[PDB]
Amino acid sequence: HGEKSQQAFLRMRTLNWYDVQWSKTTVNVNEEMVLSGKVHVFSAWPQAVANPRVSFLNAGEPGPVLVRTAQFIGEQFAPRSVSLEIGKDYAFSINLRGRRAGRWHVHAQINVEGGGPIIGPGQWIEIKGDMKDFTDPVTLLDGSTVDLEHYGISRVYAWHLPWMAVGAAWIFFWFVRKGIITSYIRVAEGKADDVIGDDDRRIGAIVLALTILATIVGYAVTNSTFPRTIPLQAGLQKPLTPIETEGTVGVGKENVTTELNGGVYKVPGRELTINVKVKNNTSQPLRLGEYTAAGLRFLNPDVFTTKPDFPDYLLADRGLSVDATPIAPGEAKEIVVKIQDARWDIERLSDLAYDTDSQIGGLLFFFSPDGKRYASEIGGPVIPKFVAGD
């Protein structure tokens, strides 16, 4: 939930997040909502962050308020680490079973090997019920079921607590049998030898014999129950398959091309002005309708006359404008875009002045006459305008 504090330029120039959706913004305990979305792996991946060759998909949530039943990315079931190729887009989804009653703000999240966490968008998710009621469950290969919430905890305590008690016996035994001070003084004087000497050692040799025997038994038993068992399954997954539809940055015969060519944000701010050398490249006239940054959406109300379903917070209606002059096909045009919203500042993206790379990143969304969306990646150096203000 800390996305606010992460370095602005890094959240912008790594993972570009889009079409994130939550099945249901309410669930019962045991009721099975699902979070999904698509992500574009920025092309000019910052030095600061490991290459995303090793990454992991996650539900950004305050502990297991929702169990995760499964998740997928790049068209694979991804309970282990996966590779993300710079410049491509991947689609993902996470199957989330409610568990703890309350109002949690649940995120899409991916972490890079030597990078750290990158947080997507998050939506409040009211859960109701009593946690007492939550179950899993899960099926073994042998065919049986087990409720995970509880399975095995019994057996654990069964082995731990007895031994802890044994340990405490051993101590209390010697303690009250030969004091601290008594035994200190004995030792401090000549002896010693009063303190130990067999048959103190007979006790020891016996206690030990029982201990080992307690082990060989406990082993053999727990070896009879569960005589199957396999080792923990680990390691990087086979390469993913990216999105090929359609398009979708650098995919298909038709597409938009955006260069950045100068930028300026106010400090302090709410505003960003960028000149974009668009090319299109499709065969329809394109209007620019959306710009996404760190999960932040900036909409052209000319194109988003309405007005999507998307957590607040997060979703702006001032990603405007052009001269709504649809451009192509074929047409190459440099177009001043103003991006203005309180969210830009509220999401600390105006703290880009603080960064060691004053640089912008993200996706542009052009639309045709009809629905058809065409995506192009924008990025590069934007300059601050140092305005009077706090």
Partner 1 sequence: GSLGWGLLFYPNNWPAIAAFHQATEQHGQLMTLADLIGFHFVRTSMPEYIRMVERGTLRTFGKDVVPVAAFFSGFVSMMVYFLWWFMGRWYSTTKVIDTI
Q: Which residues contact a second copy (rule: CB under 8 A)?
A: 43-44, 46-48, 81, 141-142, 228, 230-239, 353-358, 379-380, 383-386
Shortest CB 277 distance to partner 1, Å: 12
Shortest CB 60 distance to Cu ion, Å: 6
Of the candidates 128, 160, 191, 201, which one interacts with partner 1 according to CB under 8 A?
160
Shortest CB 57 distance to partner 1, Å: 9
Place of tokens 């790594």: 14
Sign, CA torsion 383/386/389/390: positive
Which positions from 228 through 247 interact with partner 1, judged by CB under 8 A?
Answer: 228-236
x/- site string to partner 1, residues 92 to 131, per CB under 8 A? -----------------x-x-x-xxxx-------------
Which positions from 119 through 178 interact with Cu ion, judged by CB under 5 A?
Answer: 122
Of the candidates 1, 160, 201, 307, which one interacts with Cu ion according to CB under 5 A?
1
Is the link from the previous residue into 46 a cis peptide, with omega within 30 of 0? no
Select from a second copy, Cu ion, partner 1, none the partner in contact with residue 181, using the beta carbon and a kind-dependent cut-off of 5 to 8 Å.
none
Is the Cβ of residue 237 or residue 321 nearer to partner 1 in the bound state?
Answer: 237
Shortest CB 47 distance to a second copy, Å: 4
Q: Which long-range contacts (CB under 8 A, 24 or more apart) does 242-251 make?
A: 242/74, 242/85, 242/88, 242/89, 242/90, 243/38, 243/88, 243/89, 243/90, 243/91, 247/374, 247/375, 248/89, 248/375, 249/40, 249/87, 249/89, 249/363, 249/375, 249/376, 249/377, 250/87
Shortest CB 36 distance to partner 1, Å: 16
Decide if residue 372 touches Cu ion (CB under 5 A): no
Which positions from 185 through 214 interact with partner 1, judged by CB under 8 A?
Answer: none
Decide if residue 6 touches partner 1 (CB under 8 A): yes
Shortest CB 257 distance to a second copy, Å: 13
Is the Cβ of residue 122 or residue 289 nearer to Cu ion in the bound state?
Answer: 122
Question: Please, are residues 278 and 256 in contact by the beta-carbon 8 Å criterion?
Answer: yes
